[PDB]
Ligand binder design. Structure first.
Ligand SMILES: [K+]
Ligand SMILES: [K+]
Ligand SMILES: [K+]
Lengths: 418, 426
């Protein structure tokens, strides 16, 4: 039913951040001046993770549309969806393999086989669907119609794997330069025919909500995912710390614990802003999901920043650029959430059900609730005008503290009306 | 007004499974003769994982009971729930610290402090709720009542942290020999109030009720996805062919150095199939469950535990460790794992037990429309696992592969394998 999408999107959420693990798992230890090559590696892994989320979310969106055109499902449909998931989950690893092995044919060959498989599987789940129009087709407009939808939906589903088969036969047998014929497989679902039926309708609100909640949950506890399996003090530590006194050898994990606490607090607060926004969103538009994807990507990036902030690498005097990085990451991951909300200029009639319209009941409330994080990150970014850059700690402390008394911070403006 | 609970349990799922990472991350290679030490370490880690899942699941049950005794949600309530989720997230690491340091009082102290944390924030949640009846009360039952429901729910929420307070002070009182008050914390809200003593005096329900079907459904989906992709986490993060490999494999030819991950590649390719099939059985079952009783969730917890255990089994099967002639018993253990993880599902099913009036809405009753279909779809896995367990009757133990391939294959033709019995009626 609609429940089968819950698992098949929680799985996609947890597969959309599988490539974030090597970002945090790599060390930033100053043991060598290799910081040049280490940074060359960190930027590579970041560019691999950001091109993984933005290649899994589009698959998730094609999948969510296809399951929006097959609304009611049964056993065989659940099996075919499971197969489609088994194929989609192979996207991050194979994409990493292709990026790390560019000039070798097998890499992009496997990546294009990986996308061809999910394409043909979805084609199967839509053919089996349209062979049972009474049972599995969504509604009357898709049930009783010209019955010509099959052609258009098969096209919109198979264009991915077909363009891919083209890019694969052209891939590296000759001229491995036109494999941009692959990178154009992402634009067509998002926008190519909009500027160049109507199955291109915006996603369902519940689906993007569940995906965002999944990717917030995983990226919050991503730190505790290793602070638990690494920082067990290893009772052989009796020789370490010159003595026993478990608290002594445990205090070594103090920086990582202060990194976690902050990372989870910030990710949970960003999730709270996202949830207070999506609680009033009536019908998530296309631009809504487009902004949400990037917001989620930078949120997924965030834990690396929070880890780098609470590290004490060498020459830690002119290396205060770490707070600049950990603040620009927050400023991106939250300014995109704020853009999601400010995309209500004239769509407020359709979207944003009338409780937060221009001059609504709690308009300023949610507005400032969402704009609280970009401004708070900007305030810390402004540390370039002073030297006490450690103010980031106290600032994010009061930041987390605000949303409690922030109903009354709004009453402050209410009384400032006069 | 309930998406917050969805996020809370989708986070509690990964927090529950966080302790399964070191089990799979262990070294199964026997390249050094240390089978005894590695086996003891693996047993230790499995025990820690099982205890961790049990404690996090009982904490999650308490949390969902509380958030069922409060229907609506406010911003302050959302922040309090976030603090609760953080404090309860800190449970697995602290429990591992305690189990690896039982004699030192610091571990038990930190664990019962991590209880005195969550517990107290749930007390604060329910206090804030009862200070706003017309706003955050669940239904007219709690809205219009004697208002001693607060006096009862504070008790049922704080009786745990109080026991942990006692355990923590006994930890440093002298010789913490007992230290078992945490077991009493785990055991009381399940059996004690149901059997030992109840409090009353006007009183309808909602002391400790069966969990909401949506909550346990979302938790099961979370953990199932988390394992099915737990194997892919490792295969994706730690098996990049390292372009330095131009010296490795004695040549280039990326397929050469890529075939090295083949064993664990197919291991994941089978583990995902099996875990997804188990989830499909769960989804088919819970689609007809009307009102999941308490024993239903109790059995579902153990089912999820052994499901989370499964990846270790599927890694053990596809291993080619030293002396691979008499060590075939990897298939034995990996089959008992599946057998448990699915027979608990079958037991959740067989908890119909004339409760068809309440549970199992009238489509799967004795003599229902497809009761035989549901029974077979749920019992396909334990029966096939026992068939593979029967490998002890011969030597061709490799039959596990073909039999599990057939297991995946059956539910595609299940609607006709049931028609087989339908025609066999005559
Ligand atoms: K979920
Ligand atoms: K998850
Ligand atoms: K994970």
């Amino acid at each position: 039913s609609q429940r089968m999408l819950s698992f098949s999107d929680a799985l996609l959420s947890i597969i959309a951040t599988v490539m974030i693990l090597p970002v945090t798992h790599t060390e930033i230890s100053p043991e060598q001046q290799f910081d040049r090559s280490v940074q060359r590696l960190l930027a590579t892994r970041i560019a691999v993770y950001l091109m993984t989320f933005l290649i899994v979310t589009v698959a998730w969106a094609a999948h969510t549309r296809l399951f929006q055109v097959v609304g009611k499902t049964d056993d065989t449909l659940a099996l075919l969806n499971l197969a489609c998931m088994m194929t989609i989950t192979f996207l991050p690893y194979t994409f990493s393999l292709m990026v790390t092995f560019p000039d070798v044919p097998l890499g992009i060959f496997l990546f294009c086989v990986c996308v061809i498989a999910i394409g043909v599987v979805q084609a199967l789940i839509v053919g089996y669907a349209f062979h049972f129009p009474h049972l599995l087709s969504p509604q009357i407009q898709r049930s009783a119609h010209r019955a010509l939808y099959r052609r258009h939906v098969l096209g919109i589903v198979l264009q991915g794997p077909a363009l891919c088969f083209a890019a694969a036969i052209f891939s590296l047998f000759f001229v491995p330069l036109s494999y941009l014929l692959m990178v154009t497989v992402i634009l067509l679902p998002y926008v190519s025919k909009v500027t160049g039926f109507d199955l291109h309708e915006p996603l369902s609100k519940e689906r993007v909500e569940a995906f965002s909640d999944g990717v917030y949950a995983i990226v919050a506890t991503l730190l505790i995912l290793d602070i638990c399996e690494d920082n067990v003090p290893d009772p052989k530590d009796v020789k370490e710390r010159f003595s026993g006194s478990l608290v002594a050898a445990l205090s070594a994990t103090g920086p990582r614990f202060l990194a976690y606490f902050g990372s989870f607090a910030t990710v949970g607060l960003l999730w709270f802003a996202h949830h207070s926004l999506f609680l009033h969103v009536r019908k998530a538009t296309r631009a809504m999901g487009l902004l949400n994807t990037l917001s989620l990507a930078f949120v997924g990036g965030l834990p690396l920043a929070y880890q780098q902030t609470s590290a004490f690498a060498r020459q830690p005097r002119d290396e205060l650029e770490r707070v600049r990085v950990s603040c620009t990451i927050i400023f991106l991951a939250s300014i995109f959430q704020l853009a999601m909300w400010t995309t209500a200029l004239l769509h407020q009639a359709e979207t944003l059900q009338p409780s937060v319209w221009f001059g609504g009941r709690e308009h300023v409330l949610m507005f400032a609730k969402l704009a609280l994080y970009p401004c708070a990150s900007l305030l810390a970014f402004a540390s370039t005008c002073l030297l006490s850059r450690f103010s980031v700690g106290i600032f994010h402390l009061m930041q987390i503290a605000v949303p409690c008394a922030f109903l009354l911070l709004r009453l402050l403006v209410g009384l400032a009306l006069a």
